[PDB]
UniProtKB/Swiss-Prot annotation:
Organism: Homo sapiens (Human)
Localization per Swiss-Prot or TrEMBL: Nucleus, Nuclear pore complex; Nucleus membrane
Quaternary structure (record): Interacts with GLE1. Able to form a heterotrimer with GLE1 and NUP42 in vitro. Forms a complex with NUP35, NUP93, NUP205 and lamin B.
PTM text: Phosphorylated. Phosphorylation and dephosphorylation may be important for the function of NUP155 and may play a role in the reversible disassembly of the nuclear pore complex during mitosis. Disulfide-linked to NUP62. The inner channel of the NPC has a different redox environment from the cytoplasm and allows the formation of interchain disulfide bonds between some nucleoporins, the significant increase of these linkages upon oxidative stress reduces the permeability of the NPC.
UniProt tissue specificity: Expressed in all tissues tested, including heart, brain, placenta, lung, liver, skeletal muscle, kidney and pancreas.
Name of the protein in question: Nuclear pore complex protein Nup155
Similarity-based family: Belongs to the non-repetitive/WGA-negative nucleoporin family.
Disorder this protein is connected to according to its UniProt record: Atrial fibrillation, familial, 15: A familial form of atrial fibrillation, a common sustained cardiac rhythm disturbance. Atrial fibrillation is characterized by disorganized atrial electrical activity and ineffective atrial contraction promoting blood stasis in the atria and reduces ventricular filling. It can result in palpitations, syncope, thromboembolic stroke, and congestive heart failure.
Function as written in the Swiss-Prot or TrEMBL entry: Essential component of nuclear pore complex. Could be essessential for embryogenesis. Nucleoporins may be involved both in binding and translocating proteins during nucleocytoplasmic transport.
Amino acid sequence: DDPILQIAIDNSRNILYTRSEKGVIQVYDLGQDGQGMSASVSQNAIVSAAGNIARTIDRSVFKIVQIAVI
């Protein structure tokens, strides 16, 4: 995506997360020499992920409201 709607930081693991308008997530490893990445989760990844349940996570319906680091 296009813009980065939200930014989140995992304090415990020094990991950066970015959520874009489109709903793609990117998690950079924060290192002394810079950011290392960027792995991504997308709607496609999620679909593959469920592999057992689906509907609310429909393509049309699918959108991400918020992301929180654990």
